[PDB]
Design an enzyme around this catalytic site. Sequence first.
Site, PDB file in Angstrom:
ATOM      1  N   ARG A  98      38.069  -4.162 -20.095  1.00 20.35           N
ATOM      2  CA  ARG A  98      39.466  -4.017 -20.469  1.00 20.35           C
ATOM      3  C   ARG A  98      40.083  -2.733 -19.991  1.00 20.35           C
ATOM      4  O   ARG A  98      39.393  -1.738 -19.730  1.00 20.35           O
ATOM      5  CB  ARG A  98      39.579  -4.032 -22.008  1.00 20.35           C
ATOM      6  CG  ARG A  98      38.977  -2.768 -22.651  1.00 20.35           C
ATOM      7  CD  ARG A  98      38.754  -2.897 -24.131  1.00 20.35           C
ATOM      8  NE  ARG A  98      39.968  -3.243 -24.894  1.00 20.35           N
ATOM      9  CZ  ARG A  98      40.085  -3.121 -26.210  1.00 20.35           C
ATOM     10  NH1 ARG A  98      39.113  -2.657 -26.961  1.00 20.35           N
ATOM     11  NH2 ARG A  98      41.211  -3.452 -26.803  1.00 20.35           N
ATOM     12  N   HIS A 100      45.476 -12.122 -26.666  1.00 22.13           N
ATOM     13  CA  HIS A 100      46.070 -12.929 -27.717  1.00 22.13           C
ATOM     14  C   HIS A 100      47.608 -12.909 -27.683  1.00 22.13           C
ATOM     15  O   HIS A 100      48.198 -12.161 -26.896  1.00 22.13           O
ATOM     16  CB  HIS A 100      45.509 -12.580 -29.057  1.00 22.13           C
ATOM     17  CG  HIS A 100      45.927 -11.257 -29.613  1.00 22.13           C
ATOM     18  ND1 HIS A 100      46.708 -11.161 -30.740  1.00 22.13           N
ATOM     19  CD2 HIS A 100      45.543  -9.989 -29.315  1.00 22.13           C
ATOM     20  CE1 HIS A 100      46.814  -9.900 -31.103  1.00 22.13           C
ATOM     21  NE2 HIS A 100      46.175  -9.165 -30.208  1.00 22.13           N
ATOM     22  N   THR A 122      32.954 -21.817 -40.426  1.00 19.27           N
ATOM     23  CA  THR A 122      32.252 -22.616 -39.425  1.00 19.27           C
ATOM     24  C   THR A 122      31.446 -21.761 -38.436  1.00 19.27           C
ATOM     25  O   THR A 122      31.591 -21.910 -37.216  1.00 19.27           O
ATOM     26  CB  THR A 122      33.284 -23.449 -38.585  1.00 19.27           C
ATOM     27  OG1 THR A 122      34.229 -22.558 -37.936  1.00 19.27           O
ATOM     28  CG2 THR A 122      34.014 -24.355 -39.488  1.00 19.27           C
ATOM     29  N   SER A 155      34.230  -3.360 -30.235  1.00 15.57           N
ATOM     30  CA  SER A 155      34.736  -4.650 -30.611  1.00 15.57           C
ATOM     31  C   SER A 155      36.150  -4.482 -31.289  1.00 15.57           C
ATOM     32  O   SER A 155      36.873  -3.484 -31.046  1.00 15.57           O
ATOM     33  CB  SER A 155      33.731  -5.326 -31.495  1.00 15.57           C
ATOM     34  OG  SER A 155      34.262  -6.557 -31.921  1.00 15.57           O
ATOM     35  N   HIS A 167      23.463  -9.057 -27.789  1.00 16.33           N
ATOM     36  CA  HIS A 167      23.236  -8.176 -26.685  1.00 16.33           C
ATOM     37  C   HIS A 167      22.395  -7.020 -27.150  1.00 16.33           C
ATOM     38  O   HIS A 167      22.733  -6.380 -28.107  1.00 16.33           O
ATOM     39  CB  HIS A 167      24.585  -7.584 -26.203  1.00 16.33           C
ATOM     40  CG  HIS A 167      24.641  -7.167 -24.771  1.00 16.33           C
ATOM     41  ND1 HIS A 167      24.091  -6.007 -24.311  1.00 16.33           N
ATOM     42  CD2 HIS A 167      25.289  -7.706 -23.719  1.00 16.33           C
ATOM     43  CE1 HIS A 167      24.326  -5.877 -23.016  1.00 16.33           C
ATOM     44  NE2 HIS A 167      25.046  -6.900 -22.625  1.00 16.33           N
ATOM     45  N   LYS A 225      33.413  -1.046 -36.390  1.00 13.35           N
ATOM     46  CA  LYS A 225      33.546  -2.186 -35.454  1.00 13.35           C
ATOM     47  C   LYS A 225      34.256  -1.867 -34.154  1.00 13.35           C
ATOM     48  O   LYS A 225      33.936  -2.429 -33.090  1.00 13.35           O
ATOM     49  CB  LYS A 225      34.232  -3.356 -36.178  1.00 13.35           C
ATOM     50  CG  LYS A 225      34.326  -4.605 -35.377  1.00 13.35           C
ATOM     51  CD  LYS A 225      34.849  -5.743 -36.257  1.00 13.35           C
ATOM     52  CE  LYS A 225      34.693  -7.106 -35.591  1.00 13.35           C
ATOM     53  NZ  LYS A 225      35.554  -8.151 -36.229  1.00 13.35           N
ATOM     54  N   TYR A 226      35.175  -0.913 -34.167  1.00 16.47           N
ATOM     55  CA  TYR A 226      35.812  -0.524 -32.909  1.00 16.47           C
ATOM     56  C   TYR A 226      34.919   0.188 -31.961  1.00 16.47           C
ATOM     57  O   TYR A 226      35.203   0.155 -30.756  1.00 16.47           O
ATOM     58  CB  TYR A 226      37.022   0.394 -33.123  1.00 16.47           C
ATOM     59  CG  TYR A 226      38.177  -0.200 -33.994  1.00 16.47           C
ATOM     60  CD1 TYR A 226      38.613  -1.529 -33.827  1.00 16.47           C
ATOM     61  CD2 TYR A 226      38.886   0.611 -34.905  1.00 16.47           C
ATOM     62  CE1 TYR A 226      39.672  -2.041 -34.561  1.00 16.47           C
ATOM     63  CE2 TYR A 226      39.949   0.106 -35.660  1.00 16.47           C
ATOM     64  CZ  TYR A 226      40.348  -1.203 -35.481  1.00 16.47           C
ATOM     65  OH  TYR A 226      41.383  -1.691 -36.246  1.00 16.47           O
ATOM     66  N   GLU A 270      36.395 -19.428 -31.598  1.00 16.81           N
ATOM     67  CA  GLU A 270      36.229 -20.883 -31.744  1.00 16.81           C
ATOM     68  C   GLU A 270      36.157 -21.590 -30.433  1.00 16.81           C
ATOM     69  O   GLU A 270      35.360 -22.474 -30.277  1.00 16.81           O
ATOM     70  CB  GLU A 270      37.309 -21.522 -32.628  1.00 16.81           C
ATOM     71  CG  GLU A 270      37.284 -21.029 -34.082  1.00 16.81           C
ATOM     72  CD  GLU A 270      35.961 -21.228 -34.757  1.00 16.81           C
ATOM     73  OE1 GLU A 270      35.400 -22.360 -34.746  1.00 16.81           O
ATOM     74  OE2 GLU A 270      35.463 -20.240 -35.313  1.00 16.81           O
ATOM     75  N   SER A 285       6.203   5.813 -30.225  1.00 17.25           N
ATOM     76  CA  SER A 285       6.400   6.093 -28.832  1.00 17.25           C
ATOM     77  C   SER A 285       7.562   5.324 -28.185  1.00 17.25           C
ATOM     78  O   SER A 285       7.680   4.094 -28.305  1.00 17.25           O
ATOM     79  CB  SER A 285       5.164   5.699 -28.020  1.00 17.25           C
ATOM     80  OG  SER A 285       5.268   6.200 -26.681  1.00 17.25           O
ATOM     81  N   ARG A 334      43.982  -0.264 -20.235  1.00 13.83           N
ATOM     82  CA  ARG A 334      45.364  -0.038 -20.684  1.00 13.83           C
ATOM     83  C   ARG A 334      45.758   1.382 -20.525  1.00 13.83           C
ATOM     84  O   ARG A 334      44.894   2.283 -20.346  1.00 13.83           O
ATOM     85  CB  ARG A 334      45.488  -0.388 -22.162  1.00 13.83           C
ATOM     86  CG  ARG A 334      44.646   0.493 -23.020  1.00 13.83           C
ATOM     87  CD  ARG A 334      44.946   0.273 -24.485  1.00 13.83           C
ATOM     88  NE  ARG A 334      44.960  -1.140 -24.867  1.00 13.83           N
ATOM     89  CZ  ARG A 334      44.640  -1.604 -26.067  1.00 13.83           C
ATOM     90  NH1 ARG A 334      44.320  -0.769 -27.033  1.00 13.83           N
ATOM     91  NH2 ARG A 334      44.652  -2.927 -26.331  1.00 13.83           N
ATOM     92  N   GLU A 375      43.949 -13.755 -33.292  1.00 14.37           N
ATOM     93  CA  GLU A 375      43.144 -12.608 -33.051  1.00 14.37           C
ATOM     94  C   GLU A 375      43.254 -11.681 -34.243  1.00 14.37           C
ATOM     95  O   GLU A 375      42.213 -11.148 -34.726  1.00 14.37           O
ATOM     96  CB  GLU A 375      43.547 -11.913 -31.771  1.00 14.37           C
ATOM     97  CG  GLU A 375      42.684 -10.709 -31.404  1.00 14.37           C
ATOM     98  CD  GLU A 375      43.069  -9.389 -32.079  1.00 14.37           C
ATOM     99  OE1 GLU A 375      44.110  -9.352 -32.792  1.00 14.37           O
ATOM    100  OE2 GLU A 375      42.316  -8.380 -31.868  1.00 14.37           O
ATOM    101  N   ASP A 424      24.196 -15.626  -8.358  1.00 22.01           N
ATOM    102  CA  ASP A 424      23.635 -16.075  -9.626  1.00 22.01           C
ATOM    103  C   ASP A 424      22.792 -14.970 -10.228  1.00 22.01           C
ATOM    104  O   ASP A 424      22.863 -14.738 -11.450  1.00 22.01           O
ATOM    105  CB  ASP A 424      22.827 -17.352  -9.432  1.00 22.01           C
ATOM    106  CG  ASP A 424      23.695 -18.560  -9.311  1.00 22.01           C
ATOM    107  OD1 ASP A 424      24.939 -18.376  -9.389  1.00 22.01           O
ATOM    108  OD2 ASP A 424      23.164 -19.705  -9.176  1.00 22.01           O
TER     109      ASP A 424
HETATM  110 CA    CA Z   1      33.435 -21.535 -35.842  1.00 20.52          CA
HETATM  111 CL    CL Z   2      42.796  -4.808 -24.219  1.00 16.79          CL
HETATM  112 ZN    ZN Z   3      46.076  -7.193 -30.652  1.00 16.68          ZN
HETATM  113 ZN    ZN Z   4      46.271  -6.021 -33.633  1.00 18.16          ZN
END
Ligand code: CA
Ligand code: CL
Ligand code: ZN
Ligand code: ZN
Lengths: 692, 692
Positions: free
Chosen positions: A480, A323, A215, A463, A631, A641-642, A379, A570, A482, A370, A608
């Site tokens: 984030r 998550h 979806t 990501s 973006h 992806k990380y 979603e 250029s 940690r 997640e 704003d």
């Molecule tokens: Ca979806």
């Molecule tokens: Cl995190």
């Molecule tokens: Zn996790």
């Molecule tokens: Zn994990």
Amino acid sequence: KHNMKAFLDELKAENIKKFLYNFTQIPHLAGTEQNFQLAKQIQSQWKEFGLDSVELAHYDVLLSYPNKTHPNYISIINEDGNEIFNTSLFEPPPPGYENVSDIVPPFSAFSPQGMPEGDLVYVNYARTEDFFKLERDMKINCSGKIVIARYGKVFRGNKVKNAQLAGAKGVILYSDPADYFAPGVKSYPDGWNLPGGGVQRGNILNLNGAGDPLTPGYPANEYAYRRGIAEAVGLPSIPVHPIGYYDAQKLLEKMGGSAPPDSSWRGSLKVPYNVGPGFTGNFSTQKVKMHIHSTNEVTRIYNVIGTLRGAVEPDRYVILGGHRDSWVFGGIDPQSGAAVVHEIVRSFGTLKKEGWRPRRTILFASWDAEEFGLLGSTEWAEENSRLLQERGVAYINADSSIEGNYTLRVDCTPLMYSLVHNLTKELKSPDEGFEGKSLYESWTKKSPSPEFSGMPRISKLGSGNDFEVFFQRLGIASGRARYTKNWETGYPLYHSVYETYELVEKFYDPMFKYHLTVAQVRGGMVFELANSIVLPFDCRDYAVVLRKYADKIYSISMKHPQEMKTYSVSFDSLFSAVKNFTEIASKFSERLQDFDKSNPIVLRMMNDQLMFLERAFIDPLGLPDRPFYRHVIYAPSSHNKYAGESFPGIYDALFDIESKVDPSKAWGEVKRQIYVAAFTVQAAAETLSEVA
Amino acid sequence: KHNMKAFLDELKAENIKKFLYNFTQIPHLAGTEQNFQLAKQIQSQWKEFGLDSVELAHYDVLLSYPNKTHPNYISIINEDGNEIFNTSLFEPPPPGYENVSDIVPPFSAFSPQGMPEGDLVYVNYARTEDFFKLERDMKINCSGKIVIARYGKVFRGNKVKNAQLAGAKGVILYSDPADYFAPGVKSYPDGWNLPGGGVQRGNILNLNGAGDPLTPGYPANEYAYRRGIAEAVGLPSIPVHPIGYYDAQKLLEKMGGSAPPDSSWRGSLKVPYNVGPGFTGNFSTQKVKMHIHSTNEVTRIYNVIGTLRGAVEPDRYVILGGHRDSWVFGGIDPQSGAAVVHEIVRSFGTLKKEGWRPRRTILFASWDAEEFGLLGSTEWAEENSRLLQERGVAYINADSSIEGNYTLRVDCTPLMYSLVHNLTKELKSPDEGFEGKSLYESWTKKSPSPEFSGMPRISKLGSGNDFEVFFQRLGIASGRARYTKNWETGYPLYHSVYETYELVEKFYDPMFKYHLTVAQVRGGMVFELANSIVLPFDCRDYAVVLRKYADKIYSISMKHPQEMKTYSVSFDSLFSAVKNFTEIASKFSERLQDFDKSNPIVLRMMNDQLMFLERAFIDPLGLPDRPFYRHVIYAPSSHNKYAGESFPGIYDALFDIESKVDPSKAWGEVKRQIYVAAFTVQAAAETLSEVA
Ligand SMILES: [Ca+2]
Ligand SMILES: [Cl-]
Ligand SMILES: [Zn+2]
Ligand SMILES: [Zn+2]
Ligand SMILES: *[C@@H]1O[C@H](CO)[C@@H](O[C@@H]2O[C@H](CO)[C@@H](O[C@@H]3O[C@H](CO)[C@@H](O)[C@H](O)[C@@H]3O)[C@H](O)[C@H]2NC(C)=O)[C@H](O)[C@H]1NC(C)=O
Ligand SMILES: *[C@@H]1O[C@H](CO)[C@@H](O[C@@H]2O[C@H](CO)[C@@H](O[C@@H]3O[C@H](CO)[C@@H](O)[C@H](O)[C@@H]3O)[C@H](O)[C@H]2NC(C)=O)[C@H](O)[C@H]1NC(C)=O
Ligand SMILES: *[C@@H]1O[C@H](CO)[C@@H](O[C@@H]2O[C@H](CO)[C@@H](O)[C@H](O)[C@H]2NC(C)=O)[C@H](O)[C@H]1NC(C)=O
Ligand SMILES: *[C@@H]1O[C@H](CO)[C@@H](O[C@@H]2O[C@H](CO)[C@@H](O)[C@H](O)[C@H]2NC(C)=O)[C@H](O)[C@H]1NC(C)=O
Ligand SMILES: *[C@@H]1O[C@H](CO)[C@@H](O)[C@H](O)[C@H]1NC(C)=O
Ligand SMILES: *[C@@H]1O[C@H](CO)[C@@H](O)[C@H](O)[C@H]1NC(C)=O
Ligand SMILES: *[C@@H]1O[C@H](CO)[C@@H](O)[C@H](O)[C@H]1NC(C)=O
Ligand SMILES: *[C@@H]1O[C@H](CO)[C@@H](O)[C@H](O)[C@H]1NC(C)=O
Ligand SMILES: *[C@@H]1O[C@H](CO)[C@@H](O)[C@H](O)[C@H]1NC(C)=O
Ligand SMILES: *[C@@H]1O[C@H](CO)[C@@H](O)[C@H](O)[C@H]1NC(C)=O
Ligand SMILES: *[C@@H]1O[C@H](CO)[C@@H](O)[C@H](O)[C@H]1NC(C)=O
Ligand SMILES: *[C@@H]1O[C@H](CO)[C@@H](O)[C@H](O)[C@H]1NC(C)=O
Ligand SMILES: [Ca+2]
Ligand SMILES: [Cl-]
Ligand code: NA
Ligand code: NA
Ligand SMILES: [Zn+2]
Ligand SMILES: [Zn+2]
């Protein structure tokens, strides 16, 4: 007073411990009854903690599960077809849990079914460069082979995409002790190392922000129309399975063909790490065979959404999210984060019971699925995109609070650098030997930035976690934080059965003081964001990194001087745009300081502008072939992806450009991407000009 | 007082006349020096009129022009190759202008170059249904033919796309007196009818909202990267040329093959209107040959952008916009609108000189290159999309003020129905026999709605004018208004040299009273929109039309009961969504009335909800294959750019569905579109729920 210090002192290490213990007794796998029950529990306790509303939002999404009566495993098979070696069916359960049921065995989620058979090739980390080495230099061909690769360096999904684009017919992933066993530390239960029978679970999709594979664009609701499996987004087309280093040693000990090309292809097992294909002479007619019987199925998932309505700007949303689903017990991933969020909610609720409200609305989320591709967050964001686009101030993620006990780790938008610097100078360092020093000081000492003496490292957002939709799709300012390990020298028990409450209490954070620090940082950020009269964003921090990023991408392009001349490539427009942003941002700060403090409308106008600034970097056409990464300054690396990549449209158009058969076209596309970037940076800048 | 009545009484018919005369002495074709000079004039006079800033915004866009030394024309040619008939090279200029230079001759803008030759086929209006008739029933094949078609019914660009998809190698457009000559009225100069030597200019692109064919998505600035011509958006691939009815009679008088299929294929010329192919026996070896030498070229265009900063909400924008470029003199199109905007600016400036400011910012635009594909408005909106998305309250278009003298015509979003009803009850009817009655009364009497006794007709917005980017791409609430003719019984001199100041002053509006009415409606709308404390939008008006639209699209689907059963096609979700919208909208009105009138923030929150409601109907993925039409409720018809279609994703997926070879797939896509619509209507509704 009801101020930040109030919020912060109400937080307790001890509560975090209780919650963590409570969240980790049984497995909470996405889509299972136990994770539904944990959702009902969070929901009801966020209600008792005082939130104005707490709801479940559910979706029916594609998940993946092993067949309980038909287990996955891998074999060495001989010329007759006898399986002389079988990989394990499950990980040895840890002490005391050897009767817990419903421990999902190791599997690669979303693998298609299959029983391919063939010769191995060993591809190191299965990185793009590893395949380059293999195809280009070594002239080895993975077509119709079964590749075996060690985990590490990049997101496993990329590895699988690469193997597939190399013609492989299967992939075997394993954990090498070189990457998952720290020297001098014991294997679990006696240390925090990974045992030879330990295996890392995890999905292997390439979703590129899509959410539910069926979806894309739209929430997986009851009436949703769903693509057929064959048009699904991100599904691998070859079978895949993960194993421990005991099983891997057995698969690698017989490998022949070519030697590794160098020492960086060599792990720590006592085997040659030969590349192949196939096994050495005596065993040259033995083969490897995979048996995969996992099923994909549409399954219901539950987010928990808590609301603490703001007193002045209820139509502005600060989101604290992380998550709740786990591969097994989730001692670290994610319940070390979830227990922090639980205590953050409790503390905010304590103040609210005494009559306080934050200025803006705070939304609290416990995301589902997640582990299966960021599906719960995505979603939900697909469903509420319009609210979030127009009302979303910031998103603070809250997955694992620790992956280490050495120092703080922060990854966030430039817009939150100053807020983070300030918050942390007001916070106590929990570190041995910085007793009485600020968190800034210990962090800055243990983790200095490459760019500025006296400043800590702050990474850019990659990501592989639930902020993806909020930042790279929607353009909401995100961060984030940690505790992490020494940047010099994931964690070894990542996504294995051994990741338990005992792991955390015994070896990572006995006092729960690192957890508490992380709750202060996360919670403190959310507090400032939901309460400061002027949003705590500094646009000039964006101006500095944009220069740095433009220097970087220009340098990549300058590796091809000849081509820059022939095609008139250029970067002037980009540098011009970044200068303009710098100047305009600077004039905006002066106003933001000089403006008539008493005027609500002027205050709202300027807030704003601050709020829409991150939004300004979204291109509604997306990046090429990745419509959900919108973006322009930040995307996930296309090879990992990380990792975040800056100016990704241009980076990718420059990547490997010397190998393209039509340079004119390729350099045409570099120029197009330059234009898009320059334009977008100028357009963003202009959102900070006087409005009329 | 400085209230609407002040603004309205300051407007004068006499000023409008002067301005119109001033704007129509010479041609102002896009890209020519004279249109630059007229831009400099508007700019400088908007400054004298008092606006706080007036700037030119320029872009370099693909335009199209005839070759001055190599003219276009069409021939009948004989078996030897002698051109026994030539179409005209220019229109007879009108009285007094027969020495004006730089009258661009008739041409189809953006036609590629060519000299094809072949047999004619006559395709009536070249509508989708006309080709259906021709291919399906009559079994005539246009492949390799030259189609000739009369203007009318649909946008000429659609005609050309259809001919091309039918295999044609050229298209000839003409004006039939059945469609462009009203009975009992004289040809220009002695009446307002089209003479036999008159020809309608106009572009023939299929841009689908893209703007500049070379730079879709992004403003055509100095560094813009431009597609090559071959990847350009919307360009026709066969040559095209327009002619008058004298020349057309000569091309049609010899036509053979089949008879017209019925009387609705018959115009008013004294010829058989046979369909062809080719000419009758005696002349069966004569042929038609086109000579097209037009060039496309990137040319600079200039918008004029005037700003009247708001006192309270300067970061909210009401836009009054219309174009300035003309095919020739633009007596009606567009200078009858531009002169109205000029007087509107003058009147707003008069109040500002006396110290008044509107509550919100008002932006005034004089767009360029509208005739060439809405290119000025679109490039400018591409450049400022972020500002407009977040700050745009409404857009009121201001092209031609009259196309008739019978009654008012309004096309707009449902959100502005009530504002229009109210404004017009306060305005004087300029109509013979409604002396002393309200404009509402005369309009409602002369043009009643199909749906409600006592209400006037208000159309839905189509396209073919500069509101396209603001409404269908960006989701900003838009409207337009003008005087028009009797809906029972464009105007004949549309896009011809004969469209002059004298046309207007003598035959359409000698007193300039219709113009003045139209200035009041346009200006009054903009005034209310820029000044009412609560934005003058009624969300319940959207709820009613959505029901009507869902009834309509359901009825189309019910022509296929069998297929609805086999494939489980349900509209339940859409109807559910529309009910919800109705309920939620209703609760929102109650609040909007009951809320604490004194609170700025609550007022701003609720205005933001009203402002973002139109925005809520945008789908950032677009409609299928038309990425720049993003509004889910309204798009331009795919068969006629001038007409709006409601629920277009579903309408198009139902169109001609019985002819698709894979019904399962086609009905799958109907269902997908249903889901998208239902979801979007629910999501929009939810923007009007309490925010927290
Ligand atoms: Ca979806
Ligand atoms: Cl995190
Ligand atoms: Zn996790
Ligand atoms: Zn994990
Ligand atoms: C950064 O900001 C500056 C404004 O201070 C922008 O400068 C603009 O640059 C363009 C050239 O790329 C100028 O275009 C020129 O306009 C004149 C008419 O005024 C015309 O004769 C020339 O052929 C040319 O097109 C423009 O005037 C200048 N604008 C202003 C307000 O000075 C610059 O473009 C910004 N950079 C980016 C990437 O946007
Ligand atoms: C129009 O608004 C109503 C809310 O008044 C929406 O009703 C919702 O409808 C869905 C069914 O499509 C309900 O889903 C059900 O949820 C329960 C759990 O609470 C679950 O057991 C069922 O299997 C089922 O999925 C939902 O409860 C109901 N929501 C509420 C708040 O009542 C309706 O969906 C809206 N229409 C559209 C198109 O959005
Ligand atoms: C982080 O802290 C510093 C406080 O030192 C803030 O900078 C000061 O802010 C006030 C405006 O409130 C100014 O009058 C001072 O001139 C600023 N000092 C400096 C060195 O900039 C900064 O605003 C804080 N950052 C955030 C996001 O709050
Ligand atoms: C159009 O006019 C009517 C004025 O009759 C407005 O409706 C009234 O508005 C006030 C709120 O200001 C209410 O107290 C009345 O109850 C409303 N009457 C009715 C019949 O609705 C309506 O608001 C105006 N529409 C617009 C867009 O302004
Ligand atoms: C977690 O806590 C809740 C309520 O305090 C309780 O109902 C549930 O039994 C607890 N879970 C465990 C494993 O103790
Ligand atoms: C699991 O495998 C067994 C047989 O070994 C079979 O009966 C069943 O179809 C499989 N289950 C699923 C869900 O595929
Ligand atoms: C591996 O598994 C299969 C099926 O259970 C069996 O036939 C074979 O003997 C096993 N091999 C070994 C070496 O244990
Ligand atoms: C916790 O602290 C010390 C470092 O000072 C270290 O030796 C131990 O490795 C740390 N624990 C973990 C899990 O990293
Ligand atoms: C239009 O008016 C302006 C200023 O009033 C003037 O400079 C110009 O000559 C006028 N054009 C014509 C055709 O009169
Ligand atoms: C116009 O046509 C003439 C010759 O009849 C030619 O010299 C010239 O190239 C053409 N101009 C353009 C712009 O194509
Ligand atoms: C039509 O035009 C061409 C070129 O000017 C010429 O050779 C021919 O004689 C003309 N035909 C007529 C009938 O005037
Ligand atoms: C203007 O007024 C009258 C109708 O009352 C009509 O006969 C004439 O056609 C109108 N003019 C035009 C151009 O429509
Ligand atoms: Ca463009
Ligand atoms: Cl108009
Ligand atoms: Na970092
Ligand atoms: Na109408
Ligand atoms: Zn026009
Ligand atoms: Zn026109």
